[PDB]
Amino acid sequence: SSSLVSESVVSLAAGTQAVLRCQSPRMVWTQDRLHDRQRVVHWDLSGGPGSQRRRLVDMYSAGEQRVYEPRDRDRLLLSPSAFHDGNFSLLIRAVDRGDEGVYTCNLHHHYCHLDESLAVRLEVTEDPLLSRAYWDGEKEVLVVAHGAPALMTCINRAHVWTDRHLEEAQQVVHWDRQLPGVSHDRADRLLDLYASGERRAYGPPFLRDRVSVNTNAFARGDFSLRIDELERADEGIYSCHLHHHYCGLHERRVFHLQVTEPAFEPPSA
């Protein structure tokens, strides 16, 4: 399926060229494996709204975690196989007053450009029997005794976070056309665009000559339909369908193209 992004009605004059804009930074891919399968997990430390977040430790997919402060070495620890079940939890071997603050567990996909985060408030007390982890309504709160370890759990069992296959190969753009009178599901496919570069045009040769997409479509994430020499046979309900099945993006944009109206027309959305 897909989700409706934006609607517009397009009224253009006969003899002109229609350009139906369909752009998205989330459909960008390139004809090279520019570390798309590379993800990053990182723990950040802040101390309220009036402090600067500091990157504490991060870890690339299929890699080892890197900590930025030599003092924190062998003290802030992640599971080395964190990407197998999605347990991105951080164990602090021995805590001090300098560790108090909000820790955010941030997952980031460099290819999908998604970020997800959770917060935990760390406060260091002196009594170990008061040490607890609880949910204050929107975040976990850690009370930790001095010198005790603190295991802040960060578990994300989504398939994108665990070491599944995670390269789709079949990001696809569809250009669909809904003619007057045709019921749904029987809409004619106009154009198939695979992220790998393949394009598929449908219809008799006389029609294929009039339907085109820019040659660097996936390079800029621009799949705008250009149809030269607008005819009444170009009228209908067009839909751009972006499908990234593995990362769960399924969106469509709808364009009502009518070619029966001169330069007096008002734009929508």
Binding site: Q31, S81, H84, D85, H159, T162, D163, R164, H165, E167, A169, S196, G197, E198
Partner: protein
Amino acid sequence: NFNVYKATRPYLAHCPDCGEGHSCHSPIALERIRNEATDGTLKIQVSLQIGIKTDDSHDWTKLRYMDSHTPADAERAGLLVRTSAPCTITGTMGHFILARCPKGETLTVGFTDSRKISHTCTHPFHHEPPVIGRERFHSRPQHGKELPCSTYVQSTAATAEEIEVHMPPDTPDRTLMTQQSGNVKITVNGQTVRYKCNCGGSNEGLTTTDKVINNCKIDQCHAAVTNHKNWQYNSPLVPRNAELGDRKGKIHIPFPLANVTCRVPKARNPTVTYGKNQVTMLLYPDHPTLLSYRNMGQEPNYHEEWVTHKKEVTLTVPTEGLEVTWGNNEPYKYWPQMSTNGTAHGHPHEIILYYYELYPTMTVVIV
């Protein structure tokens, strides 16, 4: 998450050229090679199961293997696939190895098991990737044409392909019986053991305990641990379930093929010069590339060759033009012309040289 290997066993086989002069019984024994990709990768049917623990977990750094009725565990960084160099391993799953590997006349596999021994064995395999486009090359270039080609994708639960896994027949071990001066001491090692004897009393049957069998030697009898509780697949190097056809099982063979687009290097643009009616052309090759030419008249007069060194060749252009292509780049058209010198409107005869320029070898015949 993708755990269908829950009852198979990473069986041990007989590898027919284990190196060091002779064949062996080995767990690592590859059986079937797949090379159907155009671009030059290899898919390997091996006798192991990689990335699965003995409790069928998703521990993707270990590997199961059979040795002496034991499914034991080693680790994933010990593998080496080789033909003439270490091949670049890409995809490890179960009986299935996906790798990319340079030019070589053989193929061996080898790795370190849990007892620190690099078991290695090979097969002959005339591995040569086919040419793509018009070029023989070395490495993936900066820029080139985008030709269709085929490769194996790293998905796992792909259906529409099957192999049949089943019950193992038996395994004869003569490491069991000991001669007690005419007796034998059959052990069981916590299993189900078949004996067969040329010995009165206990000649046939199936024992479950340790036995002492009177007045008949070790080699007079038989000993074979009969597994029932797990699965092996039908190998052509394993004896069958020795009564009839195979017990039904189900394992799909993962990592299927797909179309893909791959870059091929462009040619180096050659240097041309133009002589009277005909062309001369020096080429700059760096890896062996072919060159072909025809004309566009009635007949093709088609010629071609591969080249490796820099050559300067001449080509006669007829009045209907010429076409020559070189590398992946665009076919070069060429057309003749009404020459640099002739003989213009002059006070001497001074037409006939001109009357060669149009129409050589003819229309001087009507003179």
